[PDB]
Design a protein around this ligand. Structure first.
Ligand code: HDD
Ligand code: HDD
Lengths: 727, 727
């Protein structure tokens, strides 16, 4: 009855292994000894399988799971086949509505721990002691596309963290840029409808490159700041591990003395900031639409845990009006040059889920889920968010008991007088379902606010004004933050912004929309506007050329913290290199290559023209991970070609193209021995060039140079060379 | 208050226009003069917009749709803002569950007309009169991926037609291959779970290239026939217009005399059969994941209506047991050499929907929706389908009144005693909600069966047997039909099948699964098995090399109707050519090109290195449709390069790569004058070669030669030359 192979090769090892070395697996089978309070609390609903009988949902053992019940073995199926009907009924109802936005997302378990007690600024229990370990569940996402859309689209990314604290669930529901597109939540359906596939034909998926999006942008200049970020390489991250996170809104921290401090939340990636380039990102949506989901899961299985440092920008209440912009305007960022990010703790993602649907798809995050020690502000985008995230779950998760779905359950106590609702799990024994009551001595009871374990009380902010549907005049400035962002980018980052706008606007069919957007760009920076205009065949008018640029932000000419690359921070651990094999590899080269990569935590994939094995010059049998076409250069950070029988691959079109694609995408390339003959396909002269490592053999210096290139992510100096490369 | 441009360039012309000439639009605005009975019946629910006030859903005019109501213009949002809450509530609940399978689909309205009355074989009213026009709504789909997944995946395609007949809705719910993967509906959740993204991590989207799919296949040889089709180029159609359709199951036709005839349904595409090649299809999921949806919509907007001829394979009842296979086995096809397809009528798709969600997403097709004159058989896959398609709508469409959703409503009368349910639209006035009743004189009343307008009565098939969960032994043959399919393919189609298996199995991480699948291939054809094994580094054993091939199918060693290309059926109308411009095009070349393409109904897209315009040698201003990168060769059927200032583009990497990609993908290429210098980038010698049209100018037979190549779809003779091309 055993269908597994006798050698046990069906089962992945329950130990950390590099990407591709083992089949991936549910987290509790891959890493059974990785534990936290939330993961342990899910044990009551985890279901095994080994050595159990196959049954109906009612516990009846099934004898024949291959056939329907029929009148004769060639006869009609009988209505009395309850086993068939139960199985098909469950199948028929598997799908639930996807999230209205951020439907495409990938999630993992982990933990957060503060660096020190923050009691002087907040009474939030999870920040009260460096010994406080708080389990987290984090979901990263795109915004526009459906749950089945591609990972490496150009889009904003979501970054949502559920903190299972001892005083309640706190959800920090943020994005990978520090501002949003719009100012008031009332416009959210308009903006989302504009960016989403257009309603007649439901095109395009996962793209803002269409008329309705740019129509809205051209008519709503408040959007321009976040549009700038989306058109930059920020819109195409290399990995969820290599992007920043931001809460966007100004919130409040409330301490035990009742003092409010304004705060904006930041996540700083330990792996550094790194993004793809557009042609690579777009092609990768075809070669591997699951690239980010896969890379996150495989990093965790390898022990390359994503880590993010939590940071606070803190502004005293008395400083509310000390900036050129309104702190409550979510289209404005707070420059780190003006208000530094103070690091307060670290989050580590160290276990994948067991079941994607049960844990990821059904997870409900909501920024109104705060705890004592935190509070809101009047940011009019945040204010409306507070309504949406509870409301939407009534259809998405089937009713008001969504907190009883296991992933959503608090790990701390919860007791109240709420009852019933669809799929009610908790069986209340309280004689009372109301308060005040005497029949249960008024339990469960209210708790006054206090320094710890106290009830929630809102900060008593003064409100004065008339009931109005009116935007604050302080919000009516749209160009200075886009300009600060533009001026803070490197020259190659600016080029990529220009190319982003140019590519997207080329896909807008109505030319006047393109012209209106270019006019908006002329209010931000005329170099940007002229460069985009040239790519669109648009000529700026003399009036447009005379638009006065917007003022600096509180005296800032630039803020390098807004650039992905101006200040180096990259780390190579967890990156991956393609090694292009031949049928008689120089084993000495491969030994030195793999040894150096291992010392730095860099993974490798051995590629060839077919699957199976090749044998090196010394008899070493080399297992092949993928073909050149099966694992394209898009999926790796650098390419190494060792020596050997180079004639075997010298005329292989896929092998030559592998290097040309990597070259065009600015990736480091290293060539040993006779592999240097491949310089011809990338038009590199005999004297070489920066970004192409070459030597007689692979060695320590050879690998040191390559790993130095990898630490810099891409070879930006190659950009002037790639336009003549046919790739 | 007008935001539209004064020149009116926001509004697409309400007349047929070629792809890209105008913005696309809702069908009733693009083609207001196109009508049918179903389209007319939807007018009661169509909603306009021009010249109307913006309101709440309760009809209250909105004054300020830009702001929430707050206490002061910098204050908190008020709970009494019912306008905000209604708008956000509707947004928060927009999504409904996607279809369990076939979630990704594209749909259009049209009509069907039979060629002559079929009353000798069926009393079905829609087939009773050549003047009887039946409106249709057709949805084409993939199978595996979500609603946001890509079009040009390797997968089976769905082809579902809703016929709004005078005697009820008939849904013909078929696929683009003539068999299914499994024999008994009880296994459907198993097969679908195996092909769908794996449950731990929800990878991969839109792909069968993963362990669990091939695990199931290797353990269920009944799947091998449809697997063969999926691995062939059938799995990657060029367009929904260029694929076949099949009902798969044997059904019955019932005539007025009560005689039953077995029938299998077929759709023959007027545009012929045409598919992509794998590398092109995969890259196209990245460059345009909406390619098939877009092509269908734009063909209809151009007046190039998709057309399909309905055909029947007809088998007398007394011939049930005269074949080598069981007629009720849905893993077996009926070879057209044994039972020809008899043409029945024509279907034309001539109008796009107005709202994708309302009409496409909410449409419910179900093969149990038959009409008098049709009936089922005991095919055990069909039998279980009959349960599923009603059941699934209870969650997907919110309850049992899904037939009241406008797209689903019959156009003929419907009256019964059913009442209530969620979203009940119909307000019944019958004093009775039961029968028999006297209080309404028993109306609505049963109708006896008869030759026309009679009640439904099942064919009184004899049933004899014990109640068993047992597969018919006649179904227990798995290899002859895969072999017949294999032997019917051209040599290049066979190579593409080999490459499909090889690519997919290379993505299976557990090697023993690959080995088990190769063993199954050895039971089908040893040449196929050896070629796949070689690409996987697997050596067949002596026992595998000695497996006796399966028998022929009723004496057939081939049936050319199973090949896409063995018998040419290509038509060029609706195809598209890229024209690569330069900054001083030879206008005489372009005149001849566009004239010849227009005469054959072939579209063109003028491409350059930027948007805007270029000016030809004679001063003609040429509008640019897209950049080389913006509209890659993947999206066209052929490439033409006119003469002019060729030096302007000769060193353009994108322009050179455009030709190399098209060359690798076997597309016709035509080069005029100095454009012949591009032969160097595709390694074509001065002598030229078949598939590369060249001449001093585009006059003479230049365009005839190119259009002849296009009629043959791809340049199969070029295959030996593509492996050296780095593209
Ligand atoms: C008033 C409506 C509204 C507005 C203005 C916003 N959102 Fe939102 N957001 C939703 C309404 C919403 C929602 C419809 O409630 C979602 C979709 C499904 C869900 O559970 O919540 C959601 C989902 C959602 C997710 C995915 C959570 C997950 O992984 O499940 C993230 C990361 C964000 N949002 C982040 C933001 C950010 C950073 C915003 C700007 C500051 C923002 N949202 C504005
Ligand atoms: C017992 C389960 C079952 C089985 C054996 C099949 N299907 Fe099915 N099919 C469904 C259960 C189902 C479903 C779950 O009921 C769907 C999904 C959502 C829906 O409305 O119907 C569906 C959808 C669906 C669609 C999409 C309709 C649309 O566009 O909305 C097509 C074309 C098919 N199927 C075709 C087939 C074919 C050709 C089959 C094999 C002969 C087949 N199905 C077997």
């Amino acid at each position: 009855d055993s269908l597994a192979p006798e050698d046990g090769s069906h089962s992945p090892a329950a130990e950390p292994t590099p990407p591709g070395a083992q089949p991936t697996a549910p987290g509790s089978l891959k890493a059974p000894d990785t534990r936290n309070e939330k993961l342990n609390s899910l044990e009551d609903v985890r279901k095994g399988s080994e050595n159990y009988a196959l049954t109906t949902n009612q516990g009846v053992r099934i004898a024949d799971d291959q056939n329907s019940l029929r009148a004769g073995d060639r006869g009609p199926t009988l209505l009395e086949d309850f086993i068939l009907r139960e199985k098909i009924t469950h199948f028929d109802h598997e799908r639930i509505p996807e999230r209205i936005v951020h439907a495409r997302g990938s999630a993992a378990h982990g933990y957060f721990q503060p660096y020190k007690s923050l009691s002087d600024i907040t009474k939030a229990d999870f920040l009260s002691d460096p010994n406080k370990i708080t389990p987290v569940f984090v979901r990263f996402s795109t915004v526009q596309g459906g749950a089945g859309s591609a990972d490496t689209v150009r889009d904003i990314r979501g970054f949502a963290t559920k903190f299972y604290t001892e005083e309640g669930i706190f959800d920090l529901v943020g994005n990978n840029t520090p501002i949003f597109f719009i100012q008031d939540a009332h416009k959210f359906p308009d903006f989302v409808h504009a960016v989403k596939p257009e309603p007649h034909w439901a095109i395009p998926q996962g793209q803002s490159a269409h008329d309705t999006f740019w129509d809205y942008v051209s008519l709503q200049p408040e959007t321009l700041h976040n549009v700038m970020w989306a058109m930059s390489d920020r819109g195409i991250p290399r990995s969820y591990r290599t992007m920043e996170g931001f809460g966007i809104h100004t919130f409040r921290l409330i301490n035990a003395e009742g003092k409010a401090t304004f705060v904006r939340f930041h996540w700083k990636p330990l792996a550094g900031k790194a993004s793809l380039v557009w042609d690579e990102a777009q092609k990768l949506t075809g070669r591997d639409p699951d690239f980010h989901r896969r890379e996150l899961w495989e990093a965790i299985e390898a022990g390359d845990f994503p880590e993010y440092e939590l940071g606070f920008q803190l502004i005293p209440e008395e400083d509310e009006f000390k900036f050129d912009f309104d702190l409550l305007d979510p289209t404005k960022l707070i420059p780190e040059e003006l208000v530094p990010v103070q690091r307060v703790g670290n989050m580590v993602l160290n276990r994948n889920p067991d079941n994607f649907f049960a844990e990821n798809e059904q997870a409900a995050f909501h920024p109104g889920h705060i705890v004592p020690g935190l509070d809101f502000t009047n940011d009019p985008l945040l204010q409306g968010r507070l309504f949406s995230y509870t409301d939407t779950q009534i259809s998405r998760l089937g009713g008001p008991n969504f907190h009883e779905i296991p992933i959503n359950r608090p790990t701390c106590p919860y007791h109240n007088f709420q009852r019933d609702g669809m799929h009610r799990m908790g069986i209340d024994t309280n004689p009372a379902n109301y308060e005040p009551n005497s029949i249960n001595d008024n339990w469960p009871r209210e708790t006054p606010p206090g320094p710890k374990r106290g009830g929630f009380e809102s900060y008593q902010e003064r409100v004065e004004g008339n009931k109005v549907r009116e935007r604050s005049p302080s919000f009516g400035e749209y160009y200075s933050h886009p300009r600060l962002f533009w001026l803070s980018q490197t020259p190659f980052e600016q080029s990529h912004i220009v190319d982003g706008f140019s590519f997207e606007l080329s896909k807008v069919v109505r030319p006047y929309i393109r012209e209106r957007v270019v006019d908006q760009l002329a209010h931000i920076d005329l170099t940007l506007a002229q460069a985009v205009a040239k790519n669109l065949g648009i000529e700026l008018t003399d009036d447009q050329l005379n638009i006065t640029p917007p003022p600096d932000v509180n005296g800032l000419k630039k803020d390098p913290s807004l650039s992905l690359y101006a200040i180096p921070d990259g780390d190579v651990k967890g990156r991956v290199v393609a090694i292009l094999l031949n049928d008689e590899v120089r084993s000495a080269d491969l030994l030195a290559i793999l040894k150096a990569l291992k010392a730095k935590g860099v993974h490798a994939k051995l590629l060839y023209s077919r699957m199976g094995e090749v044998t090196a010059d010394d008899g070493t049998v080399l297992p092949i991970a993928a073909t050149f076409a099966g694992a394209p250069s898009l999926t790796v950070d650098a390419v190494i070609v060792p020596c050997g029988n180079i004639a075997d691959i010298a005329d292989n079109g896929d092998a030559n193209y592998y290097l040309m694609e990597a070259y065009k995408h600015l990736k480091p390339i290293a060539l040993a021995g006779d592999a240097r003959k491949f310089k011809a396909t990338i038009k590199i002269a005999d004297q070489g060039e920066e970004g192409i490592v070459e030597a007689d053999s692979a060695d320590g210096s050879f690998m040191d140079e390559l790993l130095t290139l990898m630490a810099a992510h891409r070879v930006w100096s190659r950009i002037p060379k790639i336009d003549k490369i046919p790739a």
